[PDB]
Amino acid sequence: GAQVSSQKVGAHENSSTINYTTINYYKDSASNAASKQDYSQDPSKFTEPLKDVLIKTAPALN
Amino acid sequence: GAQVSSQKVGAHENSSTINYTTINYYKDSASNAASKQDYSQDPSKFTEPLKDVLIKTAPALN
Amino acid sequence: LFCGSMMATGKILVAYAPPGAQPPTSRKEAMLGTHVIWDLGLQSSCTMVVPWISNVTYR
Amino acid sequence: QDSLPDTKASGPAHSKEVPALTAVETGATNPLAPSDTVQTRHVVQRRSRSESTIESFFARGACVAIIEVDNEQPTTRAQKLFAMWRITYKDTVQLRRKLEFFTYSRFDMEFTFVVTANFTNANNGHALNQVYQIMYIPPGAPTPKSWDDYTWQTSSNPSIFYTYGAAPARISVPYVGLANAYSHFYDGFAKVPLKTDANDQIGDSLYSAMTVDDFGVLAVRVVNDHNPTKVTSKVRIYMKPKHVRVWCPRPPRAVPYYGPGVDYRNNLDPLSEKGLTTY
Amino acid sequence: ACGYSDRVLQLTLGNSTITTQEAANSVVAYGRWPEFIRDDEANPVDQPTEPDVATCRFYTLDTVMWGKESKGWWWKLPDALRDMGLFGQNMYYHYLGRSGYTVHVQCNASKFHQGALGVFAIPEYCLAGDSDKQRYTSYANANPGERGGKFYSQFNKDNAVTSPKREFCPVDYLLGCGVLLGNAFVYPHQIINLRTNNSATIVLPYVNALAIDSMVKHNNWGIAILPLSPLDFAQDSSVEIPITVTIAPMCSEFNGLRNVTAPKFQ
Amino acid sequence: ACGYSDRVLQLTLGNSTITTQEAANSVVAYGRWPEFIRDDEANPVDQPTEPDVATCRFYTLDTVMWGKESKGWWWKLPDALRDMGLFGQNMYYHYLGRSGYTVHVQCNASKFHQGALGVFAIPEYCLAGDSDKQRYTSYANANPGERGGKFYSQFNKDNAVTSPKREFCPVDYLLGCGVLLGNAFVYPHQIINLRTNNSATIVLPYVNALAIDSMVKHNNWGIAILPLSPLDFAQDSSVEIPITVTIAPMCSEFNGLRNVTAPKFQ
Amino acid sequence: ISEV
Amino acid sequence: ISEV
Ligand SMILES: CCOC(=O)c1ccc(OCCCCC2CCN(c3ccc(C)nn3)CC2)cc1
Ligand SMILES: *C(=O)CCCCCCCCCCCCC
Ligand SMILES: *C(=O)CCCCCCCCCCCCC
């Protein structure tokens, strides 16, 4: 059940990809740590809720 | 995710290559121990910064 | 955003001076840095982008 | 293998090649080996530079601060119910000197905290075991005015809760510099005086200093409400640089440090008396 | 082949050419030639200015005289060039500026003169001050421009507390910074030993914890020239020969244009 | 397609951007865009300086006011830009300099105002003088810098012989130069007619009998702005609206670097 | 294992 | 494993 992922290495030792291992010990997922591997998304639903979304080089009002 | 390397064995017991095992437990590489497997380099950038690097048996000034 | 009447017209200079010199007191000095000349008209709003110009990687 | 080069067997010479002569004016160190100037035997070399690698040189937890905090009846005059320390390697000299062989560095930092305590007075009853809160306050964040005010709520700042008697506390910090490397030396100013300034204090700055708060502070307190008897505690902070890289070598500090910059004051006489022709 | 030599060089940059018939080869600091900021090391997003030949050419500073009592001279970069033609204008019109340098130090004498100049290029050359007050040297004093500063044989603490001088007090055997001068050789350097060579030539890369920075707020390189061996001639007890420093910016680029910076040097 | 128009333009050069919502298209003088000197038209052999974004950007001159009595304004190039940032520094540090220009003239009012500005870009705009004395206008008077000069409705001969003014006397219907203004339209031009457009945009190529010349000794282009139809509003007999001129150097290159030219404008 |  |  071990889960293996690559670390995003910031300061590299003078010694390439480094990994870390995770194992869940409990049946209830609420007990689990946070994966912190979070996908992002477009702001458009907030920055552009327009029915006709227009392109920035064209006149906003036409 | 276990990582296995050879130890540089100093005093050998009266009993060949011996190994040690490493596993990273944390997502942040800052949390990691030091590998201590460090590659070296030439001193020349310090001992010889000359535009025309010359060979020791020839006259330094010519 | 210009919230004036439609019969109102005008041209405005909006600017950005990266650090290190005297903070602008005249249009003459402001002109010399990053700037947009905004013309008021049917498109009511103007956007000036302040480009990332820094020495450090994070302020 | 990481052993050093073997010594080559070298015999007599009568030649136009002269390794022994050179000209240091060029800026170069003469690349000579024993076999260039004396007859040598073959030696299979097994020695290595394993312990003098940059990581191995700094791979040790060094004492950078002694923070003192008291736990006692909150009276009404300047007390030590909580304490603050600006994070630095400059309140101590030993690690400071080691880091300063180099102009720039880049590394992750490991902090270990040793906490000791004792009874301040002859006797008023005793004290139940104490829990300590070590809170990091990054620049910009509200600093505490009182040992139990809202800032200790620590919702976003990282805090360590240490139980007295437990194994010394330990955390790791990423490389957190605003630049691509840490500057151990900065030949400059944070501000420039301009000809058009009102007072000439507007543009005044400390030489060599960069940001006002550098990296923030560690605020320390005893979470326990006070016992009748006073308990005094000290938190010793040990710092270790790990996953280390360094650039541009420098001469080591030869005279005693005098504050956070390169300033010297006295004991400017580092070298002993020895006669020119005395072994 | 043909007749070439380690001692005879011609350096050409822009409309300027330097010849030398008595060089001791030349140094490239840390083995790195000057170069422009690469896209994958770039931080300011605005299109840079690269003035090329108009700034990357040889500027000759005011000559200093070397005599039997001369303890040494120092300069900072870009500061020594702040008033140098179009380089200076580009430096003061932009918030950001990076540049490498070719440093050519000149000092000839005669086969009967004697002495040796230690020429050192130091990254981040922080100097020590006047006072009990730490890190208190004023900007105007820290930056002598083309004039440079000097070294002293000993530490005279600026005593006048009430109206302080806020100057550096650079002691020679301590490299003006709390270390021993004999170890300054770990820094990029050459020696002008008068029986061997007329000059020193050091090529400096941009060195910093950042790809580009404020040239007005921060000096990148310090140039320290100290007499390792004192000037001597015949029996004349008061000899004097000129030292001339010529410096060229290289691969100069500037970001963050706006109105001109006018620092207060009073 | 999408919604584009002849009246709405965005001009971007260096760190500067101009927007306009009421343009009357834009003119490229003689159908030629600015360009650099080609190798087969090259004359000075020294490697040129091309300052690019630091000089080829929009400089806005001091605003002039248009009122019912305003007879007209004139400017010369490069002169109007001699003190403009790094362009000015490059102009005065080199013997030779060539450059093209984007000229943007700005004048808005209201749908109830009235009037028409004739905006003319003239190659070699030689102006007429003060006196009985021919070709006697002084350099300092010929070159008003950013201020520009004005036109007059009539010829007032500078009478004071003994201590002469040595100024131009540009009469409006004679285009300040002995010809009739109505024919000035053979020169590259636009009209700012207030019911139609806020502005004029003229792109100027370098024009000369040579590929490159002295910018300090010689102006290449003259900018003449004359009211073809007088400013009028409602019934208010003393109306006044601002005219603002913004100009950008383009494809600027300089040869013959040395110490800075400091002309005497007293 | 489930190595991602 | 990742045995080096
Ligand atoms: C002022 C001169 O010294 C330096 O330049 C210099 C450079 C780098 C240094 O590294 C420290 C930077 C990180 C600062 C802190 C970041 C977080 N820290 C924490 C955080 C949370 C806890 C609970 N305990 N410690 C402790 C350290 C320290 C000093
Ligand atoms: C998947 O996990 C198979 C590999 C298991 C390796 C040994 C795990 C040792 C830890 C056991 C966890 C028990 C938790 C209740
Ligand atoms: C790679 O690691 C696969 C093999 C895992 C062997 C068992 C590891 C037991 C330790 C689990 C570490 C959990 C750390 C959060």
Give E214's Cβ-side CA count (13 Å radius).
20
**A50 at F interface, C-beta within 8 A:** no
User: Residue D141, class by beta-carbon neighbours within 10 Å (0-12 exposed, 13-18 middle, 19+ buried)?
Assistant: middle
Contact A22, B44 (CB under 8 A): no
Contact F71, E69 (CB under 8 A): no
Integer Cα distance of E13 and F49 in angstroms: 13
Partner residues linked to E16 by β-bridges: E13
SS3 of chain E: the string is CCCCCCCCEEEEECCEEEEECCECCCEEHHHCCCCCCCCCCCCCCCCCECCHHHCCCCEECCCEEEECCCCCEEEEECHHHCCCHHHHHHHHHEEEEEEEEEEEEECCCCCCEEEEEEEEEEECCCCCECCCCCCCCCHHHHCCHHHCEECECCCCCCCCCCCCCCCECCEHHHCCCCECHHHHHHCCEEEEECCCCCEEEEEECCCCCCCCCCCCCECCEEEEEEEEEEEEECCCCCCEEEEEEEEEEEEEEEEEECCCCCECCC
Question: Among B4, B21, B23, which is best to mutate for testing ligand 3, by the most ligand atoms less than 8 A from CB?
Answer: B23
- Find all residues with CB under 8 Å of E40, minimum gap 6, and list them: none
Best of D24, D25, D108 to mutate (most B CBs within 10 Å, chain B): D108
> How many of the other CB atoms lie within 10 Å of CB of F179?
11
Partner residues linked to C12 by β-bridges: C38
Q: How would you classify the pairing of strands F27-28 and F9-13?
A: unpaired
Q: How would you classify the pairing of strands F16-20 and C34-39?
A: parallel
Task: Say how many residues make up chain A.
Answer: 62
How far, in Å, is the centroid of ligand 3 from the Cα of A4? 8
Contact A21, B23 (CB under 8 A): yes
State whether the Cα torsion A58-A59-A60-A61 is positive or negative.
Answer: negative
Closest C-alpha among F129, F19, E182, E56 to residue A57: F19
Contact D254, E180 (CB under 8 A): yes
Smallest CA–CA distance from A20 into chain G, residue: G3
Which letter does DSSP use for residue F104 in this model?
Answer: E
**A8 at D interface, C-beta within 8 A:** no
- Find all residues with CB under 8 Å of F126, minimum gap 6, and list them: F177
Separation in Å, CA of F53 to nearest CA in chain C: 11
> How many of the other CB atoms lie within 10 Å of CB of F261?
14
What tokens does D164 get? 């007295």
**C42 at A interface, C-beta within 8 A:** yes
Integer Cα distance of E160 and D270 in angstroms: 28
Separation in Å, CA of C14 to nearest CA in chain A: 20
Integer Cα distance of F4 and B49 in angstroms: 60
Q: Which residues of chain D neighbour C21 with C-beta distances below 8 Å?
A: 194
Q: Which long-range contacts (CB under 8 A, 24 or more apart) does E178-181 make?
A: E178/D253, E178/D254, E178/D255, E178/D257, E178/D262, E178/D263, E178/D264, E178/E128, E179/D250, E179/D251, E179/D252, E179/D253, E179/D254, E179/D255, E180/D251, E180/D254, E180/D270, E181/E118, E181/E226
Integer Cα distance of F153 and F19 in angstroms: 35
Smallest CA–CA distance from A54 into chain F, residue: F2
Q: Is residue A1 in contact with ligand 2, taking CB distance under 6 Å? A: yes
**D195 at E interface, C-beta within 8 A:** yes
Count structural domains, chain B: 1
What three-state secondary structure class fits B16?
coil
Q: Which residues of chain D neighbour E76 with C-beta distances below 8 Å?
A: 187
At D219, which amino acid appears?
A: A
How far, in Å, is the centroid of ligand 2 from the Cα of A1? 6
- Cα angle: F162, vertex F165, F170; to 5 degrees: 135
Specify the CATH number for the domain of residue E18.
Answer: 2.60.120.20
Buried b / exposed e along E152-164 (16+ C-beta atoms within 10 A): eeebeebeeeeeb
Smallest CA–CA distance from D56 into chain A, residue: A14
What tokens does D218 get? 């560690």
Integer Cα distance of B5 and B15 in angstroms: 20
Best of D14, D26, D35 to mutate (most B CBs within 10 Å, chain B): D26
Separation in Å, CA of E210 to nearest CA in chain C: 7
State whether the Cα torsion B40-B46-B50-B56 is positive or negative.
Answer: negative
* Residue E111 to residues B4, E20, E232, Cα–Cα distance (Å): 66, 17, 11
- Find all residues with CB under 8 Å of D181, minimum gap 6, and list them: D104, D105, D106, D245, D247, E209
Q: According to the entry, how was the structure determined?
A: X-ray
**B59 at A interface, C-beta within 8 A:** no
| Closest in D53, D174, D244 to A10, CB measured | D174
Separation in Å, CA of B50 to nearest CA in chain H: 38
Integer Cα distance of F55 and F37 in angstroms: 17
Residue nearest to atom 3 of ligand 2 (CA): A1
Contact F255, F90 (CB under 8 A): no
- Find all residues with CB under 8 Å of E102, minimum gap 6, and list them: E11, E13, E58, E201, E202, E203, E204, E247, E248, E250
Smallest CA–CA distance from C58 into chain D, residue: D178
How far, in Å, is the centroid of ligand 1 from the Cα of D114? 17
Contact D110, D242 (CB under 8 A): yes
SS3 of D158-206: the string is CEEEEECCCCCEEEEECCCCCCCCEECCCCECCCCCECCCCCCCCCCCC
Question: What does the CA dihedral E44, E48, E52, E57 come to, rounded to 10 degrees?
Answer: -40
How far, in Å, is the centroid of ligand 3 from the Cα of F54? 58
User: Residue E146, class by beta-carbon neighbours within 10 Å (0-12 exposed, 13-18 middle, 19+ buried)?
Assistant: middle
Place of tokens 């490059």: F90
Integer Cα distance of D216 and D140 in angstroms: 8
Cα F54 off chain centre by: 20
Partner residues linked to E249 by β-bridges: E101
Neighbours of chain B (3+ CB pairs under 8 A): A, D, E, H
Smallest CA–CA distance from E259 into chain F, residue: F85
- Give the helix, strand, coil percentages of chain D, each rounded to 5: 10, 30, 60
Integer Cα distance of F206 and F213 in angstroms: 10
Best of B41, B56, B61 to mutate (most D CBs within 10 Å, chain D): B56
Integer Cα distance of D140 and D125 in angstroms: 42
Smallest CA–CA distance from D203 into chain C, residue: C20
- Boundaries of domain holding F112: 1-266
Question: Among D135, D173, D208, which is best to mutate for testing ligand 1, by the most ligand atoms less than 8 A from CB?
Answer: D173
Which letter does DSSP use for residue F261 in this model?
Answer: P
Query: To one decimal place, what's the resolution in Å?
Result: 2.8
Assess whether chains B and H touch, using the rule of 3 or more C-beta pairs within 8 angstroms. Answer: yes
At E257, which amino acid appears?
A: L
Integer Cα distance of F72 and F170 in angstroms: 10
What three-state secondary structure class fits D111?
strand
List of domains in chain D: 1-279 (2.60.120.20)
Integer Cα distance of D229 and D127 in angstroms: 7
Q: Which residues of chain D neighbour A12 with C-beta distances below 8 Å?
A: 243, 245
Closest C-alpha among F237, D248, D64 to residue E186: D248
Phi-psi region of D27 (alpha: psi -120 to 50; beta: other; left: phi over 0): left
Contact E91, F55 (CB under 8 A): no
> How many of the other CB atoms lie within 10 Å of CB of F25?
11
**E70 at C interface, C-beta within 8 A:** no
Give me the sheet containing F16-20, strands edge to edge.
C11-16, C34-39, F16-20, F9-13
> How many of the other CB atoms lie within 10 Å of CB of D256?
13
Which letter does DSSP use for residue F152 in this model?
Answer: B
Integer Cα distance of F13 and F19 in angstroms: 12
Integer Cα distance of E58 and E246 in angstroms: 6
Place of tokens 């073959």: D42
How far, in Å, is the centroid of ligand 3 from the Cα of A23? 7
- Find all residues with CB under 8 Å of F44, minimum gap 6, and list them: F96, F212, F255, F256
Contact E107, E198 (CB under 8 A): yes
Helices (H), chain F: 85-93, 139-142
Task: Say how many residues make up chain B.
Answer: 62
- Cα angle: F128, vertex F131, F133; to 5 degrees: 95
- Cα angle: D16, vertex D19, D20; to 5 degrees: 110
Cβ contact, residue pair D179, C56, below 8 Å: yes
The enclosing H or E element of C31 equals: helix C27-31
End-to-end C-alpha distance for chain D, whole angstroms: 39
Cβ contact, residue pair E25, B54, below 8 Å: yes
Specify the CATH number for the domain of residue B14.
Answer: 4.10.80.10
Q: Which residues of chain F neighbour E14 with C-beta distances below 8 Å?
A: 47, 257
Computed on alpha carbons and rounded to an integer, the radius of gyration of chain C in Å comes to: 15
Integer Cα distance of E76 and E71 in angstroms: 18
Cβ contact, residue pair A15, B36, below 8 Å: yes
Separation in Å, CA of F191 to nearest CA in chain A: 25
State whether the Cα torsion E214-E217-E222-E225 is positive or negative.
Answer: positive
Ligand with minimal distance to A1 CA: 2
- Find all residues with CB under 8 Å of D26, minimum gap 6, and list them: B50, B60, B61, E24, E25, E27, E190
Integer Cα distance of E251 and E247 in angstroms: 14
Helices (H), chain A: 44-47
Integer Cα distance of B62 and D259 in angstroms: 49
- Boundaries of domain holding A15: 1-62
Q: Is residue D176 in contact with ligand 1, taking CB distance under 6 Å? A: yes
Residue F184: φ, ψ to 5°: -55, -15
How far, in Å, is the centroid of ligand 3 from the Cα of B23? 7
E85-93 and F85-93 are packed helices; what angle lies between their axes, rounded to 10 degrees?
A: 180
Contact F191, F184 (CB under 8 A): no
How far, in Å, is the centroid of ligand 3 from the Cα of D112? 25
Q: Which residues of chain A neighbour D243 with C-beta distances below 8 Å?
A: 11-14
How far, in Å, is the centroid of ligand 2 from the Cα of G3? 14
The enclosing H or E element of F247 equals: strand F240-257
Residue F139: φ, ψ to 5°: -45, -50
Count structural domains, chain F: 1
Q: Is residue A25 in contact with ligand 2, taking CB distance under 6 Å? A: yes
How far, in Å, is the centroid of ligand 3 from the Cα of G3? 11
Question: Among A23, A25, A26, which is best to mutate for testing ligand 2, by the most ligand atoms less than 8 A from CB?
Answer: A23
Q: Following DSSP, what letter does each residue of F12-66 receive, concatenated?
A: EETTEEEEESSB---EEGGG----PPPTTT----SPPB--GGGTSS-EEPPPEEE
Residue F186: φ, ψ to 5°: -70, -15
Assess whether chains F and D touch, using the rule of 3 or more C-beta pairs within 8 angstroms. Answer: no
Closest C-alpha among E86, B34, F30, F242 to residue D56: B34
Neighbours of chain D (3+ CB pairs under 8 A): A, B, C, E
Integer Cα distance of F229 and F243 in angstroms: 15
Q: Which residues of chain G neighbour A5 with C-beta distances below 8 Å?
A: 3-4
Question: Among D89, D215, D221, D239, which is best to mutate for testing ligand 1, by the most ligand atoms less than 8 A from CB?
Answer: D215
Integer Cα distance of E94 and E257 in angstroms: 4
Closest C-alpha among B6, A21, B3, B32 to residue H2: B3
Residue F129: φ, ψ to 5°: -100, 180
Partner residues linked to E248 by β-bridges: E102
At E61, which amino acid appears?
A: L
